[PDB]
Design a protein around this ligand. Structure first.
Ligand SMILES: Nc1nc2c(ncn2[C@@H]2O[C@H](COP(=O)(O)O)[C@@H](O)[C@H]2O)c(=O)[nH]1
Ligand SMILES: Nc1nc2c(ncn2[C@@H]2O[C@H](COP(=O)(O)O)[C@@H](O)[C@H]2O)c(=O)[nH]1
Lengths: 187, 186
């Protein structure tokens, strides 16, 4: 009977397009300019926040024209975890970050807890400066211990269930060419 | 003293453009079409070989039009390690891969030992099928131990020391918009 790949095609067919890939590229361009002005002379280590950060960072990187390094980090947060302690670390920041300017790049700012915990841990390693870049910002959705606002924001959105351009629908659909809203039948 | 940044800026100024960003886009386009025809129904897990595969994969992903999943892996190898016997794993393949069609994505196929070791460890996790994609193939440079041919290749190149589009020069220049060759004097 019915498969997961079958449901995924269906989810995609029922979805509503919120941003075309061209609009995302535009947002990525806007961010690049802002990142340039701030970080061009900082010799930053740009940290990809796995796995949501992958396609945004990939597309963003070649728009960045100043010396930089790349690294990555991976952390997961439980549903009911509001402190930031009790977040599972898959890939930790390194001591190499000590005395370095760091830019953290993720797909979405929601509650803000994952990214705050990640930033704290990067700081705990001795990073001179820490910035944050986010493709989408769910501006109406912070919680007290969350990273309140990000330094660089591609797009501002309402609380939709969204996917595409690195954002998953249950691990699928990171490859969808834009930002899509999940039909209420599929949320 | 001379900063690492200053040296990097200089290394980029003397560099020679092998391929433009536009050329790289077109390469990625070719790969996407071939990947579609091979894997459109396999429900693959596409696996990013860190950190070289990040920008190639990131750019590639939205070109792929079929159901898929994403994961990453990280293995490094000593140049003197002529077998895969002493590759040091940063991030290992998961058990979740058991019974799955897997695509491995990397920046460059050089000798092939690092790639073949990654494929083998993936196979050992019980993977059903493993395919390999690479942005650039140094076709002349293969060793007997390494992975001989890649299933998908973006571009074939001579043995230049190269960077850009995810490929580094001592961790730098992964952001260079295209593929570039270091000046002989570097
Ligand atoms: N795919 C998807 N993921 C989301 C959405 N909202 C939040 N997330 C997930 O939650 C993470 C951020 O969580 P926070 O710690 O900000 O509450 C993101 O990196 C992302 O994985 C959404 O609408 N779609
Ligand atoms: N930046 C850069 N990396 C290279 C080059 N040649 C080989 N490498 C690195 O070595 C890996 C290939 O190793 P092999 O498969 O030959 O053991 C690639 O994934 C890449 O990270 C090059 O010209 N430039």
């Amino acid at each position: 009977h019915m498969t997961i790949p079958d449901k995924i095609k269906a989810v995609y067919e029922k979805s509503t397009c919120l941003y075309t890939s061209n609009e995302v590229e535009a947002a990525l361009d806007r961010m690049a300019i802002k990142i340039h002005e701030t970080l061009q002379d900082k010799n930053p280590v740009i940290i990809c926040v796995m796995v949501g950060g992958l396609v945004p960072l990939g597309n963003l990187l070649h728009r960045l024209d100043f010396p930089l390094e790349v690294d990555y980090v991976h952390a997961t947060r439980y549903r009911g975890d509001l402190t930031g302690g009790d977040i599972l670390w898959k890939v930790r920041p390194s001591s190499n970050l000590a005395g370095r300017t760091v830019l953290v790049v993720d797909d979405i700012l929601d509650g803000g807890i994952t990214l705050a915990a990640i930033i704290n841990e990067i700081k705990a390693m001795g990073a001179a400066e820490v910035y944050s870049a986010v493709l989408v910002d769910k501006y109406r959705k912070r919680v007290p211990n969350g990273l309140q606002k990000a330094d660089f924001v591609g797009l501002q959105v309402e609380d939709h269930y969204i996917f595409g351009y690195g954002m998953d629908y249950h691990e699928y659909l990171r490859n969808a060419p834009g930002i899509f809203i999940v039909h209420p039948d599929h949320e």
